[PDB]
Amino acid sequence: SGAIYVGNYRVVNRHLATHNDWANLVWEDSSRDLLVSSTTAQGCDTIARCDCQTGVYYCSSRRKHYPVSFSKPSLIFVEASEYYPARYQSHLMLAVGHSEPGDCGGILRCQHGVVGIVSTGGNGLVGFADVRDLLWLDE
Numbered sequence: 001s002g003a004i005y006v007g008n009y010r011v012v013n014r015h016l017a018t019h020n021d022w023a024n025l026v027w028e029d030s031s032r033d034l035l036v037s038s039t040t041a042q043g044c045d046t047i048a049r050c051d052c053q054t055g056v057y058y059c060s061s062r063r064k065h066y067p068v069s070f071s072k073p074s075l076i077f078v079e080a081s082e083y084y085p086a087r088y089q090s091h092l093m094l095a096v097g098h099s100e101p102g103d104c105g106g107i108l109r110c111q112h113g114v115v116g117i118v119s120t121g122g123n124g125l126v127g128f129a130d131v132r133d134l135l136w137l138d139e
């Protein structure tokens with residue numbers, strides 16, 4: 001579990017969205033596994049605007065923060081699941097690191113702020129859904 005709270009917005013994994021998120025929907029994209037909903041209270045997470053390829057992520061399955069090197073956002077094939085058929089997930093970044101289902105929602109951060117959230121993983125790898133291109137979250 002996990003989410004990003006910036007201004008009057010809440011960013012979560014699309015496959016974990018609640019009834020409230022769908023009733024206060026701003027934007028959603030199945031190919032990115034993202035959903036953004038409106039909030040009554042102001043959020044104070046800083047979103048990063050960079051091309052950093054190193055950072056630190058939180059892993060709930062180990063109660064630990066781990067440093068990682070990660071790839072540039074791209075189209076990566078994701079195996080069929082209970083939430084989606086077999087497809088290409090866009091804007092995804094991979095790193096060598098531990099993850100298990102339950103770690104989705106964990107935040108990835110560099111020195112400039114929030115880079116993205118855990119969305120896929122396995123085989124000794126972890127996948128992060130990038131958010132640095134969504135400039136409307138700040139304005």
Ligand SMILES: NC(=O)[C@H]1CCCN(C(=O)Cc2cccc(Cl)c2Cl)C1
Nearest residue numbers: 033081099100101103119120121122
């Ligand atoms: N983004 C997707 O399509 C997900 C949906 C849930 C299923 N999924 C996975 O990769 C499962 C998983 C295994 C090991 C580590 C992690 Cl963090 C995860 Cl999410 C694809």
Ligand SMILES: [Zn+2]
Nearest residue numbers: 050052110112
């Ligand atoms: Zn950065």
